Each structure stands twice: as structure tokens, then as C-alpha cells.
Design a protein around this ligand. Structure first.
Ligand SMILES: CCS(=O)(=O)c1ccc(CNC(=O)c2cnc3c(c2)CN(C[C@H]2CC[C@H](C(F)(F)F)CC2)[C@H]3C(C)C)nc1
Lengths: 9, 245
């Protein structure tokens, strides 16, 4: 997801 | 079992994390209070299309959310949680934290909020077609403003809004419980030192923030069903991910 990407995963 | 020294250090860490990600400095918001939209400017906003007003609002909300995500990443203990739980907490808590932070940009004296460079009352937002939600957000902001939060209090309180062990879908609940507890100790310690424990009983019930967030999701569903293309073409993808049904 985008949250995952922003969190660095 | 966090020592008093560890708790004091946590107070400092949380406040630093917040200061570094607070979006606008409080000094700047307070200075702009005298800058209020004119009757003609307010009319211009009220005459904007529903889609353009929703688009602008979704953009500004997303910008605020991005600073909250950055807050989470810098928050002591958050990145030590598992990926699933990081997501669960942020998906549920991002908007809640933005709503709390928003009281900084609210002027209780004339009931206006800082939006696109000037202060405007709830009437600025008429084109959205969600008067009840908007009035509820203004009421919420007004209630918070009455408490006269310091920046450090907002730091500690918003950390607790985010680190909520009761969010459905958590995998490592006990890990979140421990972090939540230490943050509560941090908050309570800071309040005691500053003679401010009185504010605890005046904080809004958790159902209040939950209700505002659910109402947001519900109103977006109404808008999106009527204007699906606008949401697909113009809304920030993160806003869609967090809030779209
Ligand atoms: C928080 C960090 S800070 O540094 O303090 C700060 C504060 C403010 C700003 C610039 N101002 C804004 O960003 C801003 C101000 N007011 C609004 C929005 C954005 C969106 N909202 C309408 C929306 C609600 C949800 C509605 C819905 F539920 F119907 F979707 C859609 C309209 C109104 C309010 C009624 C919530 N910068 C930095």
C-alpha cells in the first residue's frame, strides 16, 4: 500500500 | 518497567518528534489571526463547484496527513512495531491526529480556521454540502481551544491518539499496550510537573474523534458515488487509500 511505501517497506 | 529517567527521556523524545513534524509553527498561525477572508472572498468559495472544493480540501488534508506519517516514523517505539500494526494504527489514527492538531489553526474568538492563507468561518465550506460534519469539526476545535494546549501537550496527547492499543486488527496487541502505557506515563508525568493534570477529565471522549472520522468516511462515500471520476483523476491517492470505501 501507499502507507507501507511512506513508512519505508 | 520504565524508570522515571526513561519516562522523562520519553517526554523529551515525543516533544522533539512533534516539533520536527508540526507542519506550521504556532507563531505563524497566531500572527495570521488578523487576516480574515472578506465577504466577497467567502462568496467566491461558496460559489465554487462541489468538486473543486472537495479537491482542494482533500489536498490540504493529505498534506497534513503526510506530516502525521512523518511524526509516526520519528515517534519512539512506533517503528519497532510490526508492519501490520504500523498500518493499522496510522489508517485509524492519521485523521484523528490531524483533527487534534487543527485546533492550533482555530481562532475561538471569531470561530474561524486557517485555510488557504486566511481565516474563514464554517460558511467558507458551504459548497462541500456537509454542514453537519463541518459544524461538528468546528465544535470539536472550539472545545479543544478552551483547554489552551501547549505544544508539548499536543505532542504527548497526539502520540496517545496514535498509539491506541484498542484499534481492531492489531497483531501484537501487548507490544502496543506497553508503548501506549509508557506514553501515558510520559503524558501524566509532564502534566503533573506543570500543574496541568486537570485537563485529563476535560479531554474529549474517544467516541468523539471516532465519530468525526466515521462521518468523514461516510460523507466521502456520498461524494465519491456521485463524482467517481473526480476522485480517480484529481484526489491524492493516499487520501483515497485511507478513506475511500
Ligand atoms: C494540522 C497541522 S497545522 O500546522 O496546525 C495546520 C493547520 C491548518 C493548515 C491549513 N488549513 C488546512 O489544512 C485545513 C483547514 N480547515 C479544513 C481543512 C484543511 C479541510 N477541512 C474541510 C474538510 C473536512 C472533511 C470533509 C468531509 F468529511 F466531508 F470529507 C471535507 C472537507 C476544513 C476543516 C473544517 C477541518 N495548515 C497547517
Amino acid at each position: 500500500t501507499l502507507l507501507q511505501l511512506l513508512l519505508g517497506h | 518497567y520504565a524508570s522515571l529517567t526513561e519516562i522523562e527521556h520519553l517526554v523529551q523524545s515525543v516533544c522533539k518528534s512533534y516539533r520536527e513534524t508540526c507542519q506550521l509553527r504556532l507563531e505563524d498561525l497566531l500572527r495570521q489571526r488578523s487576516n480574515i477572508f472578506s465577504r466577497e472572498e467567502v462568496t467566491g468559495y461558496q460559489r465554487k463547484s462541489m468538486w473543486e472544493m472537495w479537491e482542494r480540501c482533500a489536498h490540504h488534508l493529505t498534506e497534513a496527513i503526510q506530516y502525521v506519517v512523518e511524526f509516526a516514523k520519528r515517534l519512539s517505539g512506533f517503528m519497532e512495531l510490526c508492519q501490520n500494526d504500523q498500518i493499522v494504527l496510522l489508517k485509524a489514527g492519521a485523521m484523528e491526529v490531524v483533527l487534534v492538531r487543527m485546533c492550533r489553526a482555530y481562532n475561538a474568538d471569531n470561530r474561524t480556521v486557517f485555510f488557504e492563507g486566511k481565516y474563514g468561518g464554517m460558511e467558507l465550506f458551504r459548497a462541500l454540502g456537509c454542514s453537519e460534519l463541518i459544524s461538528s469539526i468546528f465544535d470539536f476545535s472550539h472545545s479543544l481551544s478552551a483547554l489552551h494546549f501547549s505544544e508539548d501537550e499536543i505532542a504527548l496527547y497526539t502520540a496517545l491518539v496514535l498509539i491506541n492499543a484498542h484499534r481492531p486488527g492489531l497483531q501484537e496487541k501487548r507490544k502496543v499496550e506497553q508503548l501506549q502505557y509508557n506514553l501515558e506515563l510520559a503524558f501524566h508525568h509532564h502534566l503533573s510537573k506543570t500543574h496541568r493534570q486537570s485537563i485529563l477529565a476535560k479531554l474529549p471522549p474517544k467516541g468523539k474523534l471516532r465519530s468525526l472520522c466515521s462521518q468523514h468516511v461516510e460523507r466521502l462515500q456520498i461524494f465519491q458515488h456521485l463524482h467517481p471520476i473526480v476522485v480517480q483523476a484529481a484526489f491524492p491517492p493516499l487520501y483515497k487509500e485511507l478513506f475511500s470505501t
